[PDB]
């Protein structure tokens, strides 16, 4: 059995720490109870000639340890000392060094405020001093990342809430998101515009060394240009990162699988599922048995694939966006290793119903029978699967809220009420479909969504201060294209409605640098309000929300901006609750399901749960609510269809 890659045990820490010990300050110390698992395997089974440790035979003194039944190093396939093992290597613009000299080289570079590349378990990290403004602004520049929040590694978990200290210290050692008030030492460029900071603890022996001598918080971000795959080779780090890193702290141990840090909320909610959780299987729900091997390709962004067989499913690591170049290489390598570990050969492939997805291209190359699942049906079934809803459990009403996914018959959906079970998805209602002006540009420029909402729903909209930067431009050319349907497809998107509201409040840059940026901003603004009495509503008209009444009330309710943002969240939840109540009660349904990337918004769930207390409510928890949980939803729908004999 291979278990997930795991955080250094207290025991290995104690040995690396004790003077005169053979592995004192050795940065590759591992044992039978911690260390790289999944990341160091070239093939099955889990024995040293088929790990990366074949470049290192074991010296005489690491032969009574590995061979020893009493030792906590009995069949640690990667275990080595400084005599026989990998050793650190420092590389700089006309410098070089090795071992202890290399570790000190990096420490000194970090201390002087520089960016260093450090080889971790699952890839490389870029690090600097997280207190040092100059250094953060520069890392942002070089990595191209102008706003997306940086995770930060802390020496200890002192001063954090109990719930976070608990998660931070698990063998998985994820990044945990916590209120930024708890970490005053961070410069303001770490998570600008947001209320949460992602923190982590040292989880690998090198990280423990670095932090023990640095005793300050460090940025720890992925070793790559934004929207390019993490370099995994020393060779590729040194090439890809030359203009970013001031220095390289590398090593001659190969990494064989890309494995990003996992990200959870202090609440326990899973956001990104990789290091520490993969490659654990999950049990399929009651009634799911004897399922043939099916490969589920997942979503185009935040991608994971899934392998379904028998009574279990296994999700891959976060692979990211599949429109990136070199992501297919890492994808296929992860699939190769996962199929080899599970002796898995697919007989079927399942993929998204969207014909323009990269994933749907790869499927047709496979020579297996293929089938299609609606994006929003997959989101909803993924949530039902996590809650172990039985195969014959009965219909639910689902609310699936996201940016965009392809719906029935070509429609663009992202804010829908559905009747679902594992085989069927019937669309019932939701947000009105509104144009995306300039197609792909609508997700980058929130003001385009505000314009589209105003043209549809707001009389004399040019007279509101909220619309002033749009009204001052020559907006009629784009309005003429909208009316003619030129690159302005209709979408009932919850994510785009969030962007319209954020444009109206001015809480985001006019043009965004990352996906979901305006919505995270608006949520951060609203979360600073403790709740407010307000008159803004989103009433139900038949099976849709009445956005004209929404805009007229919301635009005319002057209040501090945090209260305006809170009112929007509240009125949105109240209107969807009203819709789901009518649909579920008149069908005899007592369970409601919530899914889609928007359902990561904590204030939205809090308000939905406040207004839907008359129902049983199923929210995602152990898998991401967004696209990273999508392959699992595809796999349970495929399975249930087969189990029914269709
Ligand atoms: N305050 C925060 N709020 C939400 N998410 C956070 C926060 N801090 C860190 N994270 C997550 O930590 C992750 C690390 O890097 P990410 O930067 O997306 O992928 P990468 O492959 O490592 N590099 P890149 O491709 O540029 O993104 C991102 O998912 C962040 O969203
Ligand atoms: N806190 C939030 N509040 C509202 N919307 C959000 C929030 N976080 C993310 N989103 C939205 O959800 C989208 C991600 O949803 P997901 O289902 O993962 O992907 P997609 O929309 O690409 O199918 C983001 O682009 C953004 O539109
Ligand atoms: Mg503190
Ligand atoms: Zn150990
Ligand atoms: Zn040795
Ligand atoms: Zn989605």
Q: Compute, in angstroms, the gap from residue 299 CA to the centroid of ligand 6.
A: 8
Helix (H, G, I), strand (E, B) or coil at 352: strand
Q: Which two tokens stand for residue 471?
A: 């009204």
Nearest ligand for residue 204 CA: 4
Q: Compute, in angstroms, the gap from residue 597 CA to the centroid of ligand 3.
A: 30
Least Cα distance to 184 among 217, 207, 208, 138 occurs for 217
Nearest ligand for residue 623 CA: 2
Residue 272 CA: which ligand 1 atom is closest?
29
Task: Give residue for tokens 């976070």.
Answer: 164
Residue 196 CA: which ligand 1 atom is closest?
1
Resolution (A): 1.9
User: Distance between CA atoms of 16 and 198, rounded to whole angstroms?
Assistant: 28
Tell me if 152 sits within 8 A of 220, measured CB to CB: yes
Helix (H, G, I), strand (E, B) or coil at 204: coil
Nearest-Å Rg of the Cα atoms of the chain is 26
User: Distance between CA atoms of 474 and 204, rounded to whole angstroms?
Assistant: 56
Q: What angle do CA 554, 556, 559 make, to 5 degrees?
A: 80
Q: Compute, in angstroms, the gap from residue 601 CA to the centroid of ligand 2.
A: 9
Least Cα distance to 314 among 330, 291, 301 occurs for 291
Q: With 0-12 CB in 10 A as exposed, 13-18 as middle and 19+ as buried, what is 411?
A: middle
Handedness of CA 578, 584, 585, 589 (dihedral sign): negative
Hey, how many other C-beta atoms are within 10 angstroms of the C-beta on 471?
Answer: 15
What DSSP assignment string belongs to 106-128? HHHHHHTT--EEEE-SSSEEEEE
- The CATH number for 273-374+625-643, chosen from 3.90.930.12, 3.30.470.10, 3.30.420.360, 3.55.30.10, is 3.30.420.360
What is the DSSP code (8-state) at residue 62?
G
**299 phi and psi angles, rounded to 5 deg:** -100, 160
| Overall CATH class of domain 152-201+256-272 | alpha beta
Task: Give residue for tokens 């602004």.
Answer: 137
Domain ranges of the chain: 1-151+202-255, 152-201+256-272, 273-374+625-643, 375-624
Q: What angle do CA 591, 597, 598 make, to 5 degrees?
A: 75
Q: Compute, in angstroms, the gap from residue 119 CA to the centroid of ligand 4.
A: 19
* In CATH, 1-151+202-255 is 3.40.50.720: no
What DSSP assignment string belongs to 560-629? -HHHHHHHHHHHHHHHHHHHHHHHHHTTT--EEEEESGGGG-HHHHHHHHHHTTTSEEE---SS-SSGGG
Identical topology for domains 152-201+256-272 and 375-624:
no
Tell me if 262 sits within 8 A of 201, measured CB to CB: no
Q: Quick one: which H or E segment has residue 381?
A: helix 375-386
- The CATH number for 375-624, chosen from 3.30.300.210, 3.30.450.80, 3.30.420.40, 3.50.50.60, is 3.30.420.40
User: Distance between CA atoms of 431 and 628, rounded to whole angstroms?
Assistant: 24
Q: What is the 3-state secondary structure (H, E, C) of 396-431?
A: EEEEEEEEEEECHHHCEEEEEEEEECCCCEEEEEEC
Q: With 0-12 CB in 10 A as exposed, 13-18 as middle and 19+ as buried, what is 68?
A: exposed
CA distances (Å), origin 68, targets 23, 72, 211: 17, 9, 32
Choose which residue among 597, 602, 634 to substitute to test ligand 2 binding: the one with the highest number of ligand atoms within 8 A of its C-beta. Answer: 597
CA dihedral 132→137→140→144, nearest 10 degrees, is -160
Least Cα distance to 310 among 295, 282, 291 occurs for 291
Nearest ligand for residue 494 CA: 2
User: Distance between CA atoms of 252 and 461, rounded to whole angstroms?
Assistant: 63
Q: What method did the depositors use to determine the structure? A: X-ray
Q: Which two tokens stand for residue 334?
A: 């992860």
């Amino acid at each position: 059995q291979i278990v997930p890659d795991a955080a250094t045990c207290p025991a290995c820490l104690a040995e690396m720490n004790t003077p005169g010990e053979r592995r004192y300050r050795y940065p590759f110390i591992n044992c039978t109870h911690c260390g790289p698992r999944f990341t160091i395997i070239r093939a099955m089974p889990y024995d040293r000639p088929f790990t990366v440790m074949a470049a290192f035979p074991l010296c005489p003194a690491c032969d009574k340890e590995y061979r020893d039944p009493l030792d906590r190093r009995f069949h640690a396939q990667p275990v080595a000392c400084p005599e026989c093992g990998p050793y650190l290597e420092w590389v700089s613009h006309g410098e070089h060094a090795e071992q202890e000299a290399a570790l000190q080289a990096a420490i000194a570079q970090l201390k002087m405020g520089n960016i260093v590349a450090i080889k971790g378990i699952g890839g490389f990290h870029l690090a600097c001093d997280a207190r040092n403004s100059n250094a953060v602004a520069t890392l942002r520049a070089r990595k191209h990342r102008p706003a997306k929040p940086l995770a930060v590694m802390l020496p200890v978990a002192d001063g954090l809430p109990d719930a976070a200290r608990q998660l931070l210290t698990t063998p998985a050692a994820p990044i945990v998101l916590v209120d930024k008030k708890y970490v005053p030492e961070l410069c303001d460029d770490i998570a600008p515009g947001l209320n949460e900071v992602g923190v982590m603890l040292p989880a690998n022996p090198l990280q423990h060394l670095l932090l023990q001598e640095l005793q300050c918080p460090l940025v720890m971000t992925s070793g790559n240009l934004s929207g390019k795959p993490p370099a995994i080779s020393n060779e590729q780090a040194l090439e890809d990162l030359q203009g970013i890193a001031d220095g390289f702290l590398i090593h001659n141990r190969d990494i064989v699988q890309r494995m990003d840090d996992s990200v959870v909320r202090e609440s326990g909610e899973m956001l990104r599922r990789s290091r520490g959780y993969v490659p654990d299987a999950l049990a399929l729900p009651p009634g799911f048995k004897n399922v043939p091997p099916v490969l589920c390709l997942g979503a185009d962004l935040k991608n994971t694939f899934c392998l379904v067989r028998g009574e279990q499913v296994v999700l891959s690591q976060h692979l990211g966006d599949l429109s990136d170049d070199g992501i297919q290489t890492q994808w296929r390598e992860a699939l190769r290793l996962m199929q080899n570990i599970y002796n898995f050969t697919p007989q079927y492939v399942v993929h998204d119903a969207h014909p323009g997805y990269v994933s749907c291209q790869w499927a047709s190359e496979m020579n297996l029978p293929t089938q299609t699942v609606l994006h929003h049906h997959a989101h909803a079934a993924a949530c039902l699967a996590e809650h172990q809803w039985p195969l014959d459990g009965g219909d639910v009403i689902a609310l699936t809220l996201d940016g965009i996914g392809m719906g029935e018959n070509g429609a663009l959906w992202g804010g829908e009420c559905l009747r679902v079970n594992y085989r069927e998805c019937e669309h019932l209602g939701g947000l009105p479909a509104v144009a995306l002006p300039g197609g792909d540009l609508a997700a980058k420029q929130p003001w385009r969504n505000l314009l589209a909402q105003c043209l549809r729903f707001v009389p004399e909209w040019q007279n509101y201060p909220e619309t002033a930067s749009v009204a001052a431009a020559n907006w009629s050319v784009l309005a003429r294209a909208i009316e003619r349907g030129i690159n302005a497809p209709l979408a009932s998107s919850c994510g785009r409605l969030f962007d319209a509201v954020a444009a109206a409040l001015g809480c985001a840059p006019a043009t965004l640098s990352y996906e979901g940026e305006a919505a995270c901003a608006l949520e951060a603004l609203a979360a600073s309000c403790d709740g407010v009495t307000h008159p803004v509503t989103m009433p139900r008209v038949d099976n849709q929300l009445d956005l004209a009444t929404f805009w007229q009330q919301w635009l005319n309710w002057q209040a501090p901006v945090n209260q305006r943002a809170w009112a929007f969240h509240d009125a949105l939840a109240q209107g969807f609750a009203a819709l789901m109540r009518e649909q579920a009660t008149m069908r005899g349904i007592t369970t409601l399901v919530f899914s889609g990337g928007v359902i990561h918004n904590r204030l939205l769930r809090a308000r939905l749960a406040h207004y839907l207390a008359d129902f049983t409510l199923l929210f995602p928890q152990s898998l991401p609510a967004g696209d990273g949980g999508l392959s699992l939803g595809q796999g349970v729908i495929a399975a249930a269809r087969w189990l029914a004999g269709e």
